[PDB]
Every structure is written in structure tokens, then in C-alpha cells.
Coordinates of C-alpha atoms and ligand atoms in Angstrom, one line a residue:
X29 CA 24.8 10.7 8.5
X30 CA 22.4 7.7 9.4
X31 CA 24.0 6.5 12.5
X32 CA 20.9 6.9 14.5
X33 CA 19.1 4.7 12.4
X34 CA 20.3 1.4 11.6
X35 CA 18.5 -0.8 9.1
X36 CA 16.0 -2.8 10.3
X37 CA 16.0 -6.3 9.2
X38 CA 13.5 -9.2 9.3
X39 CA 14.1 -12.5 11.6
X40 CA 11.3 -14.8 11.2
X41 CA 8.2 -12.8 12.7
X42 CA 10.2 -10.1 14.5
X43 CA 11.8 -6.8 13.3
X44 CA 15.6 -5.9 14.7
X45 CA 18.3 -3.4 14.8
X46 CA 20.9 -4.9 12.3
X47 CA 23.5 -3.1 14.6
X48 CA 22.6 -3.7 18.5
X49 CA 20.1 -7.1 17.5
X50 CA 17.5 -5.5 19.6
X51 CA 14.4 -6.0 18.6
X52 CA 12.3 -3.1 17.5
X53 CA 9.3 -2.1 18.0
X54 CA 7.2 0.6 15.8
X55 CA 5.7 3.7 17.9
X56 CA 4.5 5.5 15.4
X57 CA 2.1 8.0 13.3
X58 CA 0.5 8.3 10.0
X59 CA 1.5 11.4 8.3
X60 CA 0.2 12.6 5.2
X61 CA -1.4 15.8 3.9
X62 CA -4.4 15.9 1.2
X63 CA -5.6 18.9 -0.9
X64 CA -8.8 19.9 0.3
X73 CA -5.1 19.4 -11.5
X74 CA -3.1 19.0 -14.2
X75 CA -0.4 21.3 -12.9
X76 CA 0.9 19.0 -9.4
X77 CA 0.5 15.9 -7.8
X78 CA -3.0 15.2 -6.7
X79 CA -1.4 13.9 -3.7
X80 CA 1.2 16.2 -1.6
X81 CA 4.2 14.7 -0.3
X82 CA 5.4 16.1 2.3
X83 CA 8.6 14.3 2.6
X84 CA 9.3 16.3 -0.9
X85 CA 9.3 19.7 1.2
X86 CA 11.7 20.8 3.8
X87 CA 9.7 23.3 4.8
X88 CA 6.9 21.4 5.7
X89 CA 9.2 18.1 7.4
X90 CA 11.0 20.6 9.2
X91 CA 8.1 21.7 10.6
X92 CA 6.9 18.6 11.4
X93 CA 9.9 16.6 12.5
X94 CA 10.2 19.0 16.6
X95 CA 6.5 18.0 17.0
X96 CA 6.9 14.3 16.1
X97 CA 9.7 14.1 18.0
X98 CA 7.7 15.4 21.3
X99 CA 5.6 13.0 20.4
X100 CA 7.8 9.8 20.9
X101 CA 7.6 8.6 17.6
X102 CA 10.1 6.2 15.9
X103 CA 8.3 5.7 12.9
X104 CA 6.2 7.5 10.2
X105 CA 3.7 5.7 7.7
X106 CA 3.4 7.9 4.3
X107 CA 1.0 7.2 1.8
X108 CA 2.1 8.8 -1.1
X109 CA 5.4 10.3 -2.5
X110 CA 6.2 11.8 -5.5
X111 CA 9.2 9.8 -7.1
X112 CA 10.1 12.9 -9.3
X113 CA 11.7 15.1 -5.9
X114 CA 14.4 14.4 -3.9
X115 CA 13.8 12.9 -0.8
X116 CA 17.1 13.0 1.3
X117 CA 17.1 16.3 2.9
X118 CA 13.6 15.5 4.7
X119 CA 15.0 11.1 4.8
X120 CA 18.2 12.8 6.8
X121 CA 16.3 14.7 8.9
X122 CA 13.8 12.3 10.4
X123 CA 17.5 9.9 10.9
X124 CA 18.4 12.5 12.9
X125 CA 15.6 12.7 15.4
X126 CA 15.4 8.5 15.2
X127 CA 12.5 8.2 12.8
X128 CA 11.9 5.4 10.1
X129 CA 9.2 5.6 7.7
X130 CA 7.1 3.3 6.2
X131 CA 6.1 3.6 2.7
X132 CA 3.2 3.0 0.3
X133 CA 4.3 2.0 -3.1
X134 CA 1.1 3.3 -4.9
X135 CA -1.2 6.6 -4.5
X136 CA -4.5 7.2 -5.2
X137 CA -4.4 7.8 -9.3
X138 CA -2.4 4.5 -9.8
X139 CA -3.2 1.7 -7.7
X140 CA -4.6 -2.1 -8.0
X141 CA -8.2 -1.2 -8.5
X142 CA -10.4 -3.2 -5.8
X143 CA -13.4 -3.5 -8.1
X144 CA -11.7 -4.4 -11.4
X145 CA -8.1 -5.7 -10.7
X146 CA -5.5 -5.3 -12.7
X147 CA -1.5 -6.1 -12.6
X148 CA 0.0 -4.0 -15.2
X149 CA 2.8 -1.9 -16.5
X150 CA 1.3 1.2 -15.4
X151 CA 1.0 0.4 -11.7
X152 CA 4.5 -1.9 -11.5
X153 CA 6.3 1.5 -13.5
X154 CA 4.7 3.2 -10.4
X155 CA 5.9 0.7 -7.7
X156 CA 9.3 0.6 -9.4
X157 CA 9.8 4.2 -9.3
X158 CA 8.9 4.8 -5.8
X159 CA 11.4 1.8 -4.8
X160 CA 14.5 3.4 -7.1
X161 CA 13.5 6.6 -5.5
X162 CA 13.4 5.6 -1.7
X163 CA 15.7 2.9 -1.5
X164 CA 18.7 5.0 -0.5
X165 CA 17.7 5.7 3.1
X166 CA 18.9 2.8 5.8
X167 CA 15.5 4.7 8.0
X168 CA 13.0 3.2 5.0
X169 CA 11.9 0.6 7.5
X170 CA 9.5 -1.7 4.7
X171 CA 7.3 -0.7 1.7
X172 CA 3.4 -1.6 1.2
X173 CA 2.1 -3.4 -1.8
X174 CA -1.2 -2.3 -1.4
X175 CA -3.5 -1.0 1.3
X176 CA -7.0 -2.6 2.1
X177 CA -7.2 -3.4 -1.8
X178 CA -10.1 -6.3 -0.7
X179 CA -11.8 -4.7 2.3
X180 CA -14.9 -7.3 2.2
X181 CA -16.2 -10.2 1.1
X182 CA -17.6 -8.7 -2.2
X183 CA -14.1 -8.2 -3.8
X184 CA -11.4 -11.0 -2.7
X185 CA -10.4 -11.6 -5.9
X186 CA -8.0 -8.8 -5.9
X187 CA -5.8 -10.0 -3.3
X188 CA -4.2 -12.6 -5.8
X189 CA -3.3 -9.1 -8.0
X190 CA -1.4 -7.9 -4.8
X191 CA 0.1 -10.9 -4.0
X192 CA 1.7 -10.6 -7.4
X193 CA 2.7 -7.2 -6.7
X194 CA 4.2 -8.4 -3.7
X195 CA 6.6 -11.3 -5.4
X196 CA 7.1 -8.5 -8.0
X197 CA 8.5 -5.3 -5.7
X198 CA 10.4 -8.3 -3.8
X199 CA 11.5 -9.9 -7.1
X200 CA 12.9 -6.2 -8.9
X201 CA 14.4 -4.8 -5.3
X202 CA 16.1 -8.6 -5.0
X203 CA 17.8 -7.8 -8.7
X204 CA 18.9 -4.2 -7.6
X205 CA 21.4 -2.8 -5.9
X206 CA 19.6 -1.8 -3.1
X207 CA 19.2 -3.0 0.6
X208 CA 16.4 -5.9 0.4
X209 CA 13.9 -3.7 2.4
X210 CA 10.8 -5.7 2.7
X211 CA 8.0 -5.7 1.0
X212 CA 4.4 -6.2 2.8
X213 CA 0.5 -5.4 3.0
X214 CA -1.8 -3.3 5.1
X215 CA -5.5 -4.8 5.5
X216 CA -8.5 -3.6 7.4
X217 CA -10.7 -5.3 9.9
X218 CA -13.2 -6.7 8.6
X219 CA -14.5 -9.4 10.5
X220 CA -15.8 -12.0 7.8
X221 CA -12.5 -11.7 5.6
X222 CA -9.6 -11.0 8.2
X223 CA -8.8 -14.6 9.1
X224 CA -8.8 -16.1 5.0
X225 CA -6.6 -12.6 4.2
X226 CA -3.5 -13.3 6.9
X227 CA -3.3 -16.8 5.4
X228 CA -3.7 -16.1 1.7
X229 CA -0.8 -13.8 2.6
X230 CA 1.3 -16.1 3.5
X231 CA 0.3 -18.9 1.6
X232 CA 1.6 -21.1 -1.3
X233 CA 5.2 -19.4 -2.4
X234 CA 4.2 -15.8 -2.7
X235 CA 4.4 -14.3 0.9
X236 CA 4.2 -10.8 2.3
X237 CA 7.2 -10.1 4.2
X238 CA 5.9 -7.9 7.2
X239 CA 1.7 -7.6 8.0
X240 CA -0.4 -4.4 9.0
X241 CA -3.6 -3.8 10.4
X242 CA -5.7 -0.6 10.2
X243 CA -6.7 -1.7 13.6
X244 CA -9.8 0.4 15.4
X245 CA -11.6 -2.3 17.3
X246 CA -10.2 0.0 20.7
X247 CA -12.5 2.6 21.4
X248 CA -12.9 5.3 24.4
X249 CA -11.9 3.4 27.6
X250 CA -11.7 0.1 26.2
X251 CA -9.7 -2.9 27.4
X252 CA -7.2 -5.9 26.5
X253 CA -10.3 -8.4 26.7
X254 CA -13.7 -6.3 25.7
X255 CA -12.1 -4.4 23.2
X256 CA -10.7 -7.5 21.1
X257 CA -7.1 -7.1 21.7
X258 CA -6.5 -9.9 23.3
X259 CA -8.9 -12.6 20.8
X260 CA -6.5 -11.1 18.2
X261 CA -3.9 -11.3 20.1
X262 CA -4.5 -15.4 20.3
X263 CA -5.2 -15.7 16.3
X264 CA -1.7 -14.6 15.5
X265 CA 0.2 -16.2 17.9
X266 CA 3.0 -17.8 15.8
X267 CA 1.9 -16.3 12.7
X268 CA 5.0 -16.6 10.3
X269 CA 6.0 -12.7 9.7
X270 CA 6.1 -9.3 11.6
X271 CA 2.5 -8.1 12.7
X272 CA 1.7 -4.8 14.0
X273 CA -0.9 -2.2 13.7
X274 CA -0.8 -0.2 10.5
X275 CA -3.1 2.4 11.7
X276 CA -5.3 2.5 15.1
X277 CA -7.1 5.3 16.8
X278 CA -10.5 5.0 16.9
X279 CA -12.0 8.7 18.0
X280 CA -15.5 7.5 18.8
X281 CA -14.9 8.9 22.3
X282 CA -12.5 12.3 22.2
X283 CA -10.4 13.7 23.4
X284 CA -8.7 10.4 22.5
X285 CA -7.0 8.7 25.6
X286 CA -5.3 6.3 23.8
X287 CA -5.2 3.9 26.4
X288 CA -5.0 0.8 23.2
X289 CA -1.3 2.1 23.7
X290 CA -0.9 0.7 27.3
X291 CA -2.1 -2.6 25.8
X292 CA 0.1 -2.7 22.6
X293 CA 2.8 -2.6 24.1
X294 CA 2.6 -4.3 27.5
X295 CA 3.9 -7.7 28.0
X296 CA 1.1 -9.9 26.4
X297 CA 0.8 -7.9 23.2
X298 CA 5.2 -7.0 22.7
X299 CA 5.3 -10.7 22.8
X300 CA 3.1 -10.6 19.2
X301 CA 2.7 -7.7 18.0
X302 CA 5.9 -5.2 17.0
X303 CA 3.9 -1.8 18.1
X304 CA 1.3 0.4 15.8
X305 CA 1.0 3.8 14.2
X306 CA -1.7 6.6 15.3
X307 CA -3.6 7.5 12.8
X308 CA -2.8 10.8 12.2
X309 CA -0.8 13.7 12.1
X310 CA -2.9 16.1 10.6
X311 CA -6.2 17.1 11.5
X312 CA -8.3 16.7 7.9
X313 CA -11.6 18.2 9.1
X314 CA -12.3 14.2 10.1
X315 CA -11.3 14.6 13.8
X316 CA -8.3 11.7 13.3
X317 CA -5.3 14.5 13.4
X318 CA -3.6 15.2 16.6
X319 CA -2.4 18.5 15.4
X320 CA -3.9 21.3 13.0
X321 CA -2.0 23.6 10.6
X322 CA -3.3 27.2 10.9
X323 CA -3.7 29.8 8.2
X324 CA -0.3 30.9 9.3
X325 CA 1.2 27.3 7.8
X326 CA 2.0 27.1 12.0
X327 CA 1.1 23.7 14.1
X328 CA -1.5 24.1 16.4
X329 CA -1.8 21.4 19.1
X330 CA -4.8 19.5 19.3
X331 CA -6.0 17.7 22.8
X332 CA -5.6 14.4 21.6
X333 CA -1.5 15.2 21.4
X334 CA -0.7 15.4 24.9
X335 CA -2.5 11.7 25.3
X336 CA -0.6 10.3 22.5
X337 CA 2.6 11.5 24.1
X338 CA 1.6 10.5 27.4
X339 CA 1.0 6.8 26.7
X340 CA 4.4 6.5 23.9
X341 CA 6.5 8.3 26.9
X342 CA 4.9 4.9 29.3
X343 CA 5.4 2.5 26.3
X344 CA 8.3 0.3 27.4
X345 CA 7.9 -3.3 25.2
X346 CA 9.8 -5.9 26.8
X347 CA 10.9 -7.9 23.3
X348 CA 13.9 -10.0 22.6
X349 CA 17.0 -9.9 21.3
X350 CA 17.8 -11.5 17.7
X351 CA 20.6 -14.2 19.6
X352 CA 17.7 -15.5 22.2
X353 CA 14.8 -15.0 19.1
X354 CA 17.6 -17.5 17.3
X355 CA 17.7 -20.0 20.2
X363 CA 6.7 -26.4 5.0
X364 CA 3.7 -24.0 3.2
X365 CA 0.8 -22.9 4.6
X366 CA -2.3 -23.6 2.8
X367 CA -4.1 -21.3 0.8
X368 CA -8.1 -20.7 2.1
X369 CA -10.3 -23.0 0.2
X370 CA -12.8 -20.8 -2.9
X371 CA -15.9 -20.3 -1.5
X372 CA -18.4 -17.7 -4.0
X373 CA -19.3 -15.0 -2.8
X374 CA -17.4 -15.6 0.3
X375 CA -13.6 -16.2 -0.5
X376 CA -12.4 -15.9 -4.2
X377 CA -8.7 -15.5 -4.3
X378 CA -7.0 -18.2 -6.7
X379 CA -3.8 -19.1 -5.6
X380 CA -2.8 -18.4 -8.9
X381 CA -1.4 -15.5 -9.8
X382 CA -0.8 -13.0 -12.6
X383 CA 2.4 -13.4 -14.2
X384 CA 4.9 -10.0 -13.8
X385 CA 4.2 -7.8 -16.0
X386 CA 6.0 -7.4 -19.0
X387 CA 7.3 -3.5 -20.1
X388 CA 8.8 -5.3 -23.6
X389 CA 6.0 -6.9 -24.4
X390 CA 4.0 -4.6 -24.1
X391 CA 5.9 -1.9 -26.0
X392 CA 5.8 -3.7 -28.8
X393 CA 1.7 -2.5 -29.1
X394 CA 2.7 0.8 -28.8
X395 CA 5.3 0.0 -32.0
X396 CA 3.5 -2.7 -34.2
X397 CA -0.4 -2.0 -33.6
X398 CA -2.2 0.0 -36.9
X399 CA -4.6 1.2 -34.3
X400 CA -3.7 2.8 -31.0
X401 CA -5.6 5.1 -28.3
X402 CA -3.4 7.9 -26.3
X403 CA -3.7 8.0 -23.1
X404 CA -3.7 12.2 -23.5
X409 CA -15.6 7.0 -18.2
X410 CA -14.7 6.5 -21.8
X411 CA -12.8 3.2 -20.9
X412 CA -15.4 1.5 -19.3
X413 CA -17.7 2.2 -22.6
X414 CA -15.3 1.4 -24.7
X415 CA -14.2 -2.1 -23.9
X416 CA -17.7 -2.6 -23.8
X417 CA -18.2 -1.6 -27.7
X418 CA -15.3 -3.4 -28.6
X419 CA -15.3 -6.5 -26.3
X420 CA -18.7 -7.5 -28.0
X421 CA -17.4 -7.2 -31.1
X422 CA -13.6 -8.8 -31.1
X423 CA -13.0 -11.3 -28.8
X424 CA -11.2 -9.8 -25.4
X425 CA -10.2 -12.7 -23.7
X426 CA -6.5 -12.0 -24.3
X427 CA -6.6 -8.6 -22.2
X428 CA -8.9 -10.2 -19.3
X429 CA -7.3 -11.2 -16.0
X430 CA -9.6 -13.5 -13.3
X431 CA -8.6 -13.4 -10.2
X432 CA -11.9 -16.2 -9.2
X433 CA -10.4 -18.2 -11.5
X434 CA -6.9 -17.7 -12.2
X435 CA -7.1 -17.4 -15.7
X436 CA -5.0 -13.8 -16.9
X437 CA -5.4 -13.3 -20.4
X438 CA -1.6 -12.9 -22.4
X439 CA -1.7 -9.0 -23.0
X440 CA -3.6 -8.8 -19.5
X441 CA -0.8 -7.2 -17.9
X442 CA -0.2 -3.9 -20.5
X443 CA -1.1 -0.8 -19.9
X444 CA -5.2 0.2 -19.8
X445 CA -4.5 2.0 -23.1
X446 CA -2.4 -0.6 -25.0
X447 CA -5.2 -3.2 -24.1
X448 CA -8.0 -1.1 -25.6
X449 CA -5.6 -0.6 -29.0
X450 CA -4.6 -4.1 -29.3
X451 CA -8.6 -5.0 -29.3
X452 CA -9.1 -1.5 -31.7
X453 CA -6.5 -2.9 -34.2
X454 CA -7.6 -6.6 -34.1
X455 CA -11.3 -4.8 -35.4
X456 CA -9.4 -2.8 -38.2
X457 CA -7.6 -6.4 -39.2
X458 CA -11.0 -8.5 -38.8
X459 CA -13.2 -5.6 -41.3
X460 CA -9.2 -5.7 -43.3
X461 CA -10.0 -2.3 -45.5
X462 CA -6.7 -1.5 -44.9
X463 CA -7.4 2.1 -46.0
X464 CA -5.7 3.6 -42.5
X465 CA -9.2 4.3 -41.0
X466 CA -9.8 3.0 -37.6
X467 CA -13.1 2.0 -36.8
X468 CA -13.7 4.4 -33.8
X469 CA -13.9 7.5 -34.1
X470 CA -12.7 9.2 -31.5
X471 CA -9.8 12.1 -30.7
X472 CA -7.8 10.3 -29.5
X473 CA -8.1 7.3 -31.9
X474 CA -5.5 7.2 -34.3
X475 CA -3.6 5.2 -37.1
X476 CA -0.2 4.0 -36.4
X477 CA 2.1 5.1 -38.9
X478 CA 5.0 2.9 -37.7
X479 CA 3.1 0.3 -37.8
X480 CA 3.6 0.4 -41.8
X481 CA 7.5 -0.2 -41.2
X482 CA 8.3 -3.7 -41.5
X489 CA 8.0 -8.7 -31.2
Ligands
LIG501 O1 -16.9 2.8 -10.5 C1 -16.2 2.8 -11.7 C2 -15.1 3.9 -11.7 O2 -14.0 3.4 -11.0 C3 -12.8 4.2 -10.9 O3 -11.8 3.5 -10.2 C4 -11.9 3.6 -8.8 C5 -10.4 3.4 -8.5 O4 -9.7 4.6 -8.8 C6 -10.3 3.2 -7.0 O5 -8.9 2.9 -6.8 C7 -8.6 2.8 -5.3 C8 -7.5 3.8 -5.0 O6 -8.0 5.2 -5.2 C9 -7.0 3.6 -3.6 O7 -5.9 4.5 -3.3 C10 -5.4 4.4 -2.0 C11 -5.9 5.5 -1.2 O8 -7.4 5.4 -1.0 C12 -5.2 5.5 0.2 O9 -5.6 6.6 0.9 C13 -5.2 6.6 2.3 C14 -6.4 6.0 3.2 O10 -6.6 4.6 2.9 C15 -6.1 6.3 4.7 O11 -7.2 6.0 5.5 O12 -5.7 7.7 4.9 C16 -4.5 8.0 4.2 C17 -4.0 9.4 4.7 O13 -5.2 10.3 4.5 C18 -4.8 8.0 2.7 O14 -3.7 8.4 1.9 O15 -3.8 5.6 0.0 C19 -3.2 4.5 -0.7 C20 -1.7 4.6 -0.7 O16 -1.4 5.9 -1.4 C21 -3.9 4.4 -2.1 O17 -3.4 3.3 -2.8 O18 -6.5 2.3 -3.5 C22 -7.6 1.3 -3.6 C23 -7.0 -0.1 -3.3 O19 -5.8 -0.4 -4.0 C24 -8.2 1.4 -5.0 O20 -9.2 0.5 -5.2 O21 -11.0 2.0 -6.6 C25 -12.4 2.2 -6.7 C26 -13.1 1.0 -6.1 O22 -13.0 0.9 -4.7 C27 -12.7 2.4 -8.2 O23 -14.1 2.8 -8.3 C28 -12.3 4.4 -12.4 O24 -11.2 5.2 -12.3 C29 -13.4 5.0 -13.2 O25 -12.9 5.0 -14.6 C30 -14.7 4.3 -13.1 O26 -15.8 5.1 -13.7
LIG502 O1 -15.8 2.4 6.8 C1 -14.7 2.4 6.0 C2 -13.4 2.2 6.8 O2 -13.3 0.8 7.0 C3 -12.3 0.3 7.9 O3 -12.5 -1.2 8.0 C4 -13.5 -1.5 8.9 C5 -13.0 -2.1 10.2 O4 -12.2 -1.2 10.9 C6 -14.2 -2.6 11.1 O5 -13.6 -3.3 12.2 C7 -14.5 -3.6 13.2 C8 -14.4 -2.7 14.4 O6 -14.9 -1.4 14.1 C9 -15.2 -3.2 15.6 O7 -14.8 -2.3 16.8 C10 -15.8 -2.4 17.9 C11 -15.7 -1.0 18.4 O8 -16.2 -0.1 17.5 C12 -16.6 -1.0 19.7 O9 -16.5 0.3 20.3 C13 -17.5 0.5 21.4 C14 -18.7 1.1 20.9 O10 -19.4 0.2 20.0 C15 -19.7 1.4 22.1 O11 -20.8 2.1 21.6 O12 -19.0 2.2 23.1 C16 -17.7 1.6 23.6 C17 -17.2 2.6 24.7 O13 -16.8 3.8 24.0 C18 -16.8 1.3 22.5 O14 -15.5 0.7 22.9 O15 -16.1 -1.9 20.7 C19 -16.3 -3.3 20.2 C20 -15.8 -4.2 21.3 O16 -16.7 -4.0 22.4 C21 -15.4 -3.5 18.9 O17 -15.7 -4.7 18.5 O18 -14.8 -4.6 16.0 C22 -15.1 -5.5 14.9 C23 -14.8 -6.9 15.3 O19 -13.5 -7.1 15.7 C24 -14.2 -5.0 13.7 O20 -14.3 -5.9 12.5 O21 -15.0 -3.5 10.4 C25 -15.6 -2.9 9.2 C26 -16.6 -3.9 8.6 O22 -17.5 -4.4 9.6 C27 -14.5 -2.5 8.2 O23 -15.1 -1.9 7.0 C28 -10.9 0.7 7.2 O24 -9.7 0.5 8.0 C29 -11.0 2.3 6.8 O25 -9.8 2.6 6.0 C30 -12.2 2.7 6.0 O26 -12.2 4.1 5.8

């Protein structure tokens, strides 16, 4: 049974019960573990475990929480015995689509089979459970001005996860994108994701500018606060907490949630559960696998219990583009156009008809570079300055560096099954011979 959660559905910039038409508001927490290799997950998902979620889930619920952001799950378990659970006690949970191994690179973007595989699987895995409030396409992929041109690779992620969920059979849960704070690239990123005909549909901040004993005005809250009045889609804080004065008060709650901010913003999550050695966790597991109760908890429960938004309900809420920021080098460089969806057909045609191919069972980076200056690799090149995304630039890492190994063998044509690396895990085709 879900009857405690309903779906939560999307009305212009507002989330809202799809039962009652109450609007909801997020109180939540981040909750993920790390390790502190090739045998498990290098991530651990806890949501894979009842052991650990049923651990979890009493504490949470003293808490006040209504929602849960995980980073990373593990598509491969089942997921409904923990999913059931949090129903139980009320709890949603946002969801990242990628994790830490497979993910839209910040420094060298790519959109490709590997990662949409990755998003796709998560989404067939999760989409079950009427308490999966939204899904991320990305977190803080451009976190300054030195590497905007990512966020068009996103944005395509975005219209993609939206675009294959819209073709399922599953409920349209929404799609959207957690940022950072940064002050020089925070204004350009909430329009460029809402901008031209790709848009995110919900928007989160990893929000820390609240510190100690802060306040609506000093803090920022409130200048924020101003800047996305009216801004097209849901807007609430994807992470906040700073712990620069501890134990944490967590007074940013009394704002958040108070009458000027509930008319913006639909709530936050604390960042975090777990205590990771990085003073952020508001509880500690012992060597015992128990939960010990760390001082910040009793504040974060304090200030939830006193949360009381005053919103509006979906009948009274009831009651044309933006423009995408202007290119700027070296200050705003995200085209408005954007890679094209990647193609899993295409693309396995390399692995079938290529003489040369490298398995994917540091020597990336050097090889492109070996090969790129000696075949020409604009084909497997994607620009997000520019919008120009070569036609093979959305395969797979691997299929990109055998496409520009085979066009070498076919350029030197010795045709004597030899390909011109040398290198394990090099090797000749033999389909390739049969005669997309
Ligand atoms: O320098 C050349 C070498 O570059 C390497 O590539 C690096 C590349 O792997 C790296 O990818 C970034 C991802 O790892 C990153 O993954 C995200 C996680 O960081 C995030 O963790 C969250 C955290 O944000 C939050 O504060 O706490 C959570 C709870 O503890 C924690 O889970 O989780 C996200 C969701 O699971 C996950 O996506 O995502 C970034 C943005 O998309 C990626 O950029 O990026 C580096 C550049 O910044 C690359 O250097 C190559 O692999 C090597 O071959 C090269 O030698
Ligand atoms: O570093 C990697 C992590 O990066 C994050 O993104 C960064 C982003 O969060 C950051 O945002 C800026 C805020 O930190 C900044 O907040 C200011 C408060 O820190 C300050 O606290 C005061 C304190 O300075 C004083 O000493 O004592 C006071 C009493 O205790 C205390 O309140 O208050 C300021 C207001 O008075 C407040 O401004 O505000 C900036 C402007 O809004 C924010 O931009 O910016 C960084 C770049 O500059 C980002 O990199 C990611 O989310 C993490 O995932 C990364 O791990």
C-alpha cells in the first residue's frame, strides 16, 4: 500500500498532492552512505538494503521528514521493500539519475550511450513507487564560470529522461537539475534552464549562504527570494546546512518556510543523514551498525516540528520562451544548441561493422591524443561553446576511440588484420569480415 503517499504532480511552479490538491512542501534530508572494487557498487545504496532503511526510516521519522534526496542507487536490486517502507511513514524520495562512475563529465562533456543506459536504468528501476517525488539530471555539473559549456549536455539529458519516461508506461515523474551557489553563474544557469524548448521541470539549490544565527535579510535569503519570484517551475533547496557554526541551529528552517519564503520556495533538504567524518551528518552509525544521535538532530527536529508553510491549494493556484543568456568567453558558454539523443542503434553498429575495436575490459586521454593527430576526430567531438556535436559524438567512450582506430587501419589499407595500436585490449574484429 501507498495510500499515504499520493503522487505529487507539477502545476506551473508549485508541487501538489494529486489526491487532496494541497500543495506540498519538501521537509527533507539527504541520505546517502559512502565507503570510506571490482566486486560491488562503489557507491552503496541504501535503499537496496532493508536492514539499513529499516534502520533509518524510526529516526527520520522523529525527525519530521517528508522527503529523502538519494544520490545513487543501484538499478540491479529491488527497491520496493525499503520504497514501501518510507510510504508508510510519509516519505518521498528524490532521486539522482547518475552516480559517481557514470555521470556527464564537467570538464570534458559528453552525452552518450553509456550515461543515457545509466539514466534509463535507474528510471525503469524507480518508476514504480507513486512516493518517487522527481528525478535529477545532473548535480552541479557547471559549478563556475570555467566550465558552462556542460550545461547544454544536461539540458539534453533533461529533454532525453523526459522524452523516454514520456514514451513509457510509467507515471510522468519529472525530470529536473540541482545547481550550486555560485555567485557569478547562478543567475545565467536558472535561465539557461528554462530557456529555448528544453526546460527542467522542477529546480534545486545546494543552498549554504545561511550560516550560524543568520537571518532572512543578512544571510541572502531574502535577495534570492526576490530573483525567483515568478520563476516558471518549482524551486526549493536541494541541499542547505551550512555547519560553519555547530551545533547547527538551523534557524534557515524558520525562514524557508515562513510566509515570505512558502510563497517561493517549496521547502529544502538538510544535508545529511549520516555523519561522514565531514561534520554535515546529524546522526552517526557506531561500530555496532547502531544510530547514534548527534547534537545537531534535536535542532533539525525542533525547527521541521515549528515548520508550518502557509501554501495554496491547486483550485486557488488555478485561479512565450524565455531567452537563453547571451555567449560571453570565459564567462557564459552554453549554446542553446544541443546534443542530439543518443543513439544505442547507431552506435552498435561500431561494435558489429568496425575491423578495429578497443574493449572496455588514463589510457583514454593518451589515446585520442595519438590517434586524433593522426585521423581526423571531428566526427566523435561534441562542443558545447559552439554547438557543433560531431555524428558518432554520442557513442560510447570506447566505440569512439575504435571508430577513429579502424578509420587508421583503412587510411594505412594493409588489410593484413593488424591494428595499428598495440595494445591488450586492441583487437581485430572478426565480424567485421561478414558482409548500418
Ligand atoms: O582530470 C582528468 C581525469 O578526469 C576523470 O574524470 C573526472 C570525472 O569522473 C568527474 O565526474 C564527476 C562525477 O564524479 C560527479 O558525480 C557526482 C558525485 O560527485 C555526487 O556526489 C554527491 C555530492 O555532490 C554531495 O555533496 O554529497 C552526496 C552525498 O555524499 C554525494 O553523493 O553524486 C552525484 C549523483 O550520484 C554524482 O553525479 O558528477 C560530476 C558532475 O556531473 C562529474 O563531473 O568529473 C571530474 C571533473 O570535475 C573529472 O576529472 C577521468 O575519469 C580520468 O580519465 C581523467 O584522468
Ligand atoms: O567548495 C565546493 C562546494 O561548493 C559548493 O558551491 C559553492 C557555493 O555554496 C558558495 O555559495 C556562496 C555562499 O557560501 C556564501 O555564503 C555566505 C556565508 O558563508 C556567510 O557566513 C557568515 C560567515 O562568513 C561569517 O564569518 O560569520 C557569520 C556568522 O556565523 C556567517 O553567517 O554569510 C554570508 C552573508 O552574510 C553569505 O553570503 O554566499 C555567497 C553569495 O550568495 C554564495 O555564492 O559559492 C561558492 C563559490 O563562491 C561555490 O563553489 C557546492 O554546493 C558543494 O557541493 C561543493 O562541495
Amino acid at each position: 500500500s501507498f495510500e499515504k503517499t499520493p503522487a505529487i504532480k507539477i502545476v506551473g511552479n508549485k508541487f501538489f498532492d494529486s489526491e487532496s490538491g494541497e500543495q506540498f512542501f519538501i521537509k527533507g534530508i539527504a541520505y546517502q552512505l559512502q565507503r570510506s572494487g571490482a566486486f560491488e557498487t562503489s557507491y552503496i545504496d541504501a535503499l537496496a538494503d532493508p536492514k539499513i532503511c529499516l534502520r533509518d526510516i524510526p529516526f527520520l521519522k522523529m525527525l519530521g521528514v517528508n522527503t529523502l534526496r538519494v544520490y545513487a542507487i543501484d538499478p540491479t536490486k529491488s527497491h520496493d521493500i525499503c520504497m514501501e517502507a518510507l510510504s508508510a511513514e510519509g516519505m518521498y524520495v528524490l532521486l539522482d539519475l547518475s552516480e559517481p562512475d557514470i555521470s556527464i563529465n564537467r570538464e570534458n562533456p559528453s552525452w552518450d550511450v553509456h550515461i543515457f543506459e545509466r539514466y534509463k536504468s535507474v528510471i525503469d528501476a524507480m518508476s514504480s513507487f507513486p512516493n518517487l517525488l522527481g528525478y535529477f539530471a545532473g548535480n552541479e555539473v557547471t559549478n563556475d564560470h570555467t566550465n558552462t559549456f556542460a550545461s547544454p549536455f544536461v539540458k539534453a539529458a533533461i529533454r532525453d529522461a523526459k522524452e523516454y519516461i514520456s514514451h513509457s508506461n510509467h507515471r510522468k515523474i519529472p525530470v529536473g537539475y540541482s545547481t550550486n551557489d555560485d555567485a557569478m553563474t547562478r543567475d545565467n544557469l536558472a535561465r539557461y534552464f528554462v530557456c529555448g524548448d528544453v526546460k527542467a521541470d522542477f529546480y534545486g539549490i545546494n543552498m549554504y549562504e545561511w550560516c550560524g544565527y543568520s537571518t532572512y535579510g543578512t544571510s541572502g535569503y531574502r535577495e534570492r527570494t526576490k530573483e525567483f519570484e515568478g520563476y516558471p517551475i518549482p524551486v526549493f533547496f536541494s541541499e542547505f546546512g551550512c555547519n560553519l557554526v555547530r551545533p547547527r541551529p538551523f534557524t534557515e528552517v524558520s525562514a524557508l518556510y515562513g510566509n515570505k519564503m512558502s510563497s517561493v520556495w517549496s521547502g529544502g533538504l538538510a544535508y545529511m543523514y549520516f555523519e561522514e567524518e565531514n561534520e554535515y551528518g546529524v546522526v552517526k552509525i557506531n561500530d555496532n551498525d547502531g544510530v547514534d544521535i548527534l547534537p545537531d538532530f534535536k535542532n533539525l527536529k525542533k525547527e521541521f516540528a515549528k515548520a508550518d508553510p502557509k501554501g495554496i491549494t491547486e483550485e486557488e493556484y488555478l485561479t512565450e520562451s524565455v531567452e537563453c543568456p547571451h555567449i560571453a568567453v570565459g564567462v557564459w558558454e552554453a549554446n542553446e544548441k544541443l546534443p542530439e539523443t543518443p543513439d544505442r542503434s547507431k552506435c552498435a553498429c561500431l561494435d558489429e561493422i568496425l575491423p578495429c575495436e578497443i574493449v572496455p575490459f588514463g589510457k583514454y586521454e593518451e589515446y585520442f591524443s595519438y590517434l586524433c593527430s593522426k585521423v581526423d576526430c571531428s566526427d566523435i567531438l561534441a562542443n558545447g561553446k559552439t554547438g557543433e556535436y560531431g555524428e558518432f559524438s554520442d557513442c560510447s567512450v570506447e566505440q569512439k576511440l575504435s571508430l577513429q582506430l579502424s578509420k587508421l587501419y583503412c587510411k594505412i589499407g594493409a588489410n593484413d588484420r593488424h591494428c595499428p595500436l598495440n595494445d591488450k585490449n586492441v583487437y581485430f574484429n572478426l565480424e567485421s569480415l561478414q558482409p548500418c
